[PDB]
Amino acid sequence: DTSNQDLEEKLYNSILTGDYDSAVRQSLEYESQGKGSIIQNVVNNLIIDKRRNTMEYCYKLWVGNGQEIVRKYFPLNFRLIMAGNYVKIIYRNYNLALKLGSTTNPSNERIAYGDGVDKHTELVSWKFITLWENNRVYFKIHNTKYNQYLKMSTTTCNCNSRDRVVYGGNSADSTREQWFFQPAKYENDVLFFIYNRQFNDALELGTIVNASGDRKAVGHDGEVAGLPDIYSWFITPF
């Protein structure tokens, strides 16, 4: 009886309010009834609205018998993220792939960069590991070559004068070693803003550091969601 439009509204509301168990139940029911278009429409609208809760919805489907729904109705990159596939993480603005540098500091940590050239070797391979906590999905961003996790400094102050350099470290148990994503649609692509769980700073590429055109990776100070052309990332298969 209830129209597909009204069910879309109910589903969107569930997701926005963080009632993921209702969202998953609804989604399974709609797909079983051949009304999967409801899910497609909600995913489209969530992304147009740049809702971070899209990630949670995807995750909860992924672990809640909804893997086929994820495959069918979300862009490919969502499955790459939830399935833990090897990926490249490429900055939209400069088209540079994320890597870690070759030297370690006394804390045994590497500095993160966008590579000026490389889009192919193991140097730019990553995978994501999910963590569900506080009714939210977070990501540990794991570097294949060096077996380290993307992070911000775990020794710096929790204050406005913090170190904003992005590093790689051996573990990912701290909120500073964890990240959350916000999707956005720009031109034909679904891209992601990637934010540090503890600091809320968006992952950004700053100034050029060498002749090959590498750029430093840093945490941005301020809102970025209006500018996916400047501050978002592509996630593509490695």
Numbering used by the authors: 8 to 245
From the study:
Here we present the crystal structure of Bombyx mori lipoprotein 6 (Bmlp6). Bmlp6 crystallized in space group P21. The N-terminal domain (NTD) of Bmlp6 (residues 1-91) consists of six helices forming a right-handed superhelix and packed in a globular form. The C-terminal domain (CTD) of Bmlp6 (residues 92–245) is folded as a ricin-type β-trefoil lectin-like domain. The interactions between the monomers in the crystal lattice are weak with no indication of possible quaternary structure, as established by the PISA server. Specifically, molecules of MES, isopropanol and fragments of PEG were mainly located at the protein surface. There are only two potential cavities in Bmlp6, denoted Po.1 and Po.2, in contrast to Bmlp3 and Bmlp7, where three cavities (No.
For example, there are significant differences in the annotations and even in the sequences of particular proteins. This is especially true of 30-kDa lipoproteins (30-kDa LPs), the most abundant group of proteins found in the hemolymph of the silkworm fifth instar larvae. They transport lipids in the hemolymph, tryptophan metabolites and pigments in diapause silkworm eggs, are involved in an immune response pathway in an antifungal defense system, serve as the source of nutrients during pupation and adult development, and are the second major yolk protein component. Bmlp6, as a 30-kDa LP member, has a fold characteristic of this protein family, classified as Lipoprotein_11 family (Pfam: PF03260). Thus, Bmlp6 is composed of two domains, the N-terminal VHS domain (Pfam: PF00790) and the C-terminal β-trefoil domain (Pfam: PF14200).
